[model samples]
Target: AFNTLVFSDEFEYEGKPDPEKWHYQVIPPNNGSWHNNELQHYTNRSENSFVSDGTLKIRAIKEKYTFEGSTKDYTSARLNSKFAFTYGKVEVRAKLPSKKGTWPAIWTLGANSNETGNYFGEQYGNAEWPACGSIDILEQNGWDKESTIAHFHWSDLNSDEYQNLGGTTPITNASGSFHVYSLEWNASAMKVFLDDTLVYELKNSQNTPYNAPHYLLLNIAMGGTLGGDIPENFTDDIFEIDYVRIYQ
Candidate 1:
């Protein structure tokens, strides 16, 4: 069967989001540990997040601590997918940011969660994490090899065990062009691909997690709890995403 083309968007509208598909995660300007002492205060308004050009742009700007609820003041935007699904092929065409302090990621998480301990306190059960499963479709560590990697994490309830799978692809000129990343999931195995090249694959789900449905995520965060410290040479960076498409 041909995989169903479920969700797709090219953000050609410019400054507003498609009401039928997205909403902002309002991080009040004052709380701490908004996940890793993250410098940008995620706000409820559109000033920090918007759709522009032919892509979804997230701007991480440095500003004084002035918001009503935040412990310190800095701002950025975090936009999440409203629909979540399981299996099949998921792909995103995008470019990454290289700012010294930028920590951009295109990943997924379980929708109905419970505990908070899987790792870095990522809320698990009504949050249990890594348990429900995590598929990092694409993640880049600064300007390293101009490469993108895939990773997954999970824990066993009975044996008290944990496991993960990941590998990297050397991207020759990623910053200058948009790359299509995909994860092909089926009953027997999961494969990660860059353009049409196979970069990594996981089979025999015995030690792996990824059994449940996962939601999509994209964010360009500044120095936080997990992405190490902000470097001295930090400057404006961008994570340009042309769109996200799914086939099942």
Candidate 2:
């Protein structure tokens, strides 16, 4: 029985987010706009992210915003969890943002310094990227409104290359309707699902870092590798979440 609930968050309050559960990841503190050459400047301001009407709303706006001596044409938000877990069932209920430039994701990253590298500062150590492992439970490219993907990333020491494997599944009314995205990770394998249908399954390996603890991350990015060309008429878009739950 997977009834042992380790963590849960229902966006029940209005206004700002619950400080005890989430923290914002901005460009300066994290030392970049984040991976994938994302064009949005992440802000902790309520204008970019907040809880309203029992939901967490992460908004992406097309505007000129400056931070750490750099001016970006867009502003959005990224939230990192204060908690981490090794193996468990993680689920999120959310509605994707549909637009020409939006990239929304529900994912996780290795929590230890052996994975995070020195970007968060020297105290976090230097092993960055694939070495740390990443899990994408749900991701949608703005250009492709009908489908979503789930993937895993890790480093291959022998080949000295970054490796990843994943699969995508089509969804009906993805932008207008809310759906449940889930990940079941154990010692043997990691399986990803959308609304109870399996999309991807990755076998665990001793060479990879999936066996370690990882923290949660939610973000809405604008115009990058997967996001593609942002229309000139694009103004604002939102990635909304109803809740997140983890069972061990």
Candidate 3:
């Protein structure tokens, strides 16, 4: 029942990411290494992210690196979409990175996520997280090579704490091969899928922030809450993406 094709990226170029469509989100001084205590330093380096052979490669490298006076042992990439949407169907064809400390995700955050100061100067959104809402269409930790999860997170009005609901499904060869991850979102509910099989369905709430527009994000993080127990000898791993398409 798809109608309009709003956005599509096949990553056909052979160099850097398309600046007109995507922007890098470097860690801010206030939000160091991101909220999850992720260890990787996000960078704009071509070595960490690039488009080649009709695929987008986001590479995570274990190396002693320094950024903005902070020394980090690993580096990776995080990309934010220039376009945001309220309700639509999104599909991403990708292959996960399977390594002990890897966390690769295709997700979305409320457009108001940066409503405070616009510190990064990108001016994405301003509302605080949880309060702003989050959607995880596809996420997998290297340790859970065969299992991928989809989740919906929002602020609990009663306790003002982050509340999330989601589900996981096992795939035969998630990291070893490419698969399609899809999300169908509208005013009433959100449905997540692996290939063509339904995985999770989250109903909308009037008190929640799901009704607003949200931006997409692609990232490969290292050593965080979900990515536990990184190997000392870990060097490099890549998250490869074939395409991302949005239909309304």
What tens-digit string does per-residue lDDT give for candidate 1 at 157-208? 4444667778988887776788898888876777889899887887736544
Over 13-109, each residue of candidate 3 has an lDDT whose tens digit, in order, gives: 8899898888887754354546577888888998799999999999999988887688788899988888888899999999889888899999998
Worst 10 residues of 2 by lDDT: 115-124
TM-score of candidate 1 against the unseen true structure: 0.82
Number of backbone-clashing residue pairs for each candidate, in the order shown: 28, 0, 8
Taken over the whole model, the C-alpha lDDT of each candidate is: 0.67, 0.84, 0.85
Candidate 3: TM-score? 0.93
What TM-score do all the candidates reach, one by one? 0.82, 0.92, 0.93
Q: Alpha carbon lDDT of residue 189, candidate 2? A: 90
Error of 2 at 51 (Å): 0.3
Off by over 4 Å in 2: 28-32, 113-126, 157-159
TM-score of 2: 0.92
Question: How much lDDT does candidate 3 score?
Answer: 0.85
List candidate 3 stretches off by more than 4 Å: 29-31, 115-125, 156-161
Residue runs of model 1 more than 4 Å from their true location after superposition: 28-31, 65-68, 114-125, 143-145, 157-160, 204-209, 231-235
> Top lDDT: which candidate number?
3
- Candidates sorted by TM-score, descending order? 3, 2, 1
